[PDB]
Amino acid sequence: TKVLLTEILLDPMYDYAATVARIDGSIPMHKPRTPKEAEYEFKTVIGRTPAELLSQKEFYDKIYTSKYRPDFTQLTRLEKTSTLIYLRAYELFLKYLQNAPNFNSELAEFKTYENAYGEQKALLAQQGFYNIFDPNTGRADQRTRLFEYKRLPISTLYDERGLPHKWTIYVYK
Amino acid sequence: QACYKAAEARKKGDKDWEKHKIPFIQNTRFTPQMAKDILAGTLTLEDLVAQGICEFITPEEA
Amino acid sequence: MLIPVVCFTCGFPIGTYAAIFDKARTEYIKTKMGGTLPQNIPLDASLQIELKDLITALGIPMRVCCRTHLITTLDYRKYY
Amino acid sequence: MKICKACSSCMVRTYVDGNIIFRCSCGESVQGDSQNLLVSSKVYHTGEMEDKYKIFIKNAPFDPTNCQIKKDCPNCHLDYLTQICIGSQKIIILVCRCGYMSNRG
Amino acid sequence: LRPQITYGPIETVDNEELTEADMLSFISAAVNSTGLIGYNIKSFDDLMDNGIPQIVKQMFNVDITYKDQRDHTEIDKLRESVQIQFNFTDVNIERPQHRNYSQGNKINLLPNKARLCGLSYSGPVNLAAEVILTAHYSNGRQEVKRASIPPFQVSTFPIMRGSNRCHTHHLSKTAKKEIGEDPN
């Protein structure tokens, strides 16, 4: 019993099912403080006691199943819209662990639903953005102070006698 | 071709052979509307590749 | 993980207007985002979203530090 | 080299009394007349000769990565040319798609 | 073959309003198409679905001959060497599993349990085979015995997290978040 409890208490599935059970009040909101509380939480979450678990060979068949069965067919875009995502995600996770029929299509349907939901959540996560516009134009400023090549007259380097300039005399006014 | 037509007019003593030359133009087919469509999620890189606007280049093809 | 209770720099009580400021932001952004998808909002290159008047209407002063920390602080609830 | 007329091997060269004799391992021996009077050779500046860049110069007008210059082709009267610079003496060659080649090539 | 598609004239493309900030949308599209590390998942999935089965079924045909050291009977004296010849015909890799120590069927092993317990996120490998043993005799006669072996698990292969054989591939972002995985 103790080794099995230590094995299963480290399972993320156990934590997820315990959270789902706490949400709808099936187990107390605090972690067990007594062996009786731990035994009760294990019985509620896993569906059977540790002794009747190893007796036999099923494990996933009776893991908690949320009490409120909302309508996930309003996840067809049509409190809510976040409770539905959470409960349907847990239910689909449990279906995955049980190799339920038609799981692969329902998973893609829920993936599209939650992609739309993540689009909403990405809208909520936006902090703003600004573009400095050029007043002459009406869009993002393209004015720069970059170098612009320009073929200068050859007289800027040579005089009318073919000699280079030597700018070594300073004129002060 | 416009260079050839200007040459064919110049060799025939025509004084307005320069009018047959067109200007050179090079451009990309990417437009500001494509940039807006990318941000709206209705245009992907695969659509740009399929429309001949962009292509993939390797260091040996570079 | 949240907008700080007070400004990190000067200690003005920024947080008492944080929650309101958050939700107002969304509404304001919903007015200006257009057809661009949310995650592409920091890429639009045509948006000009100014929160100056909103923060002023909250009563927060015109201090650089306070508005900086109010505007720029990431919310852990929006990423997890 | 010299190729044996029977086994088509590479015959070994020996020198006797002002004559070159080719001896094969099959016993065949032959005398060279004129084309076998070349003991050894060496050419210099191999990385800059004309035969090194013949294919490159032929392909130059079609490679879009080559430098172009604003000059009229004297043959087809196109108004641009392809400028290439070969060698350590920086020899400049202007080539055109029609087949024109400065340096008279 | 001639190319078919003809595009509209380049003289009529209107791009003069393109700003360099608009060109960041092209980078956005490129990164969205390739992901950031999507090549890793694609490469590992190619190894799982196509690479390992090809390597096992094509590059590991065994055909060796060993001297017979058995010399106790007349047939033992006549027999000189035995030819061992086999190849594998079926290769499969599954998702990581764990016993749970209930003397029951295997259960799914989630990545967080592997991280905490110091386990390995490794999925079982199942193999089938055909064996041919041929014994040769001094006169020049040979005897051939063939066997066909049902699929059996040989070992486990490490599974890339987030790939096809990872358990966090049939889960949603909320379910990933609730089993202790980084949902992002």
Ligand SMILES: [Zn+2]
């Ligand atoms: Zn402050």
Ligand SMILES: [Zn+2]
């Ligand atoms: Zn020419």
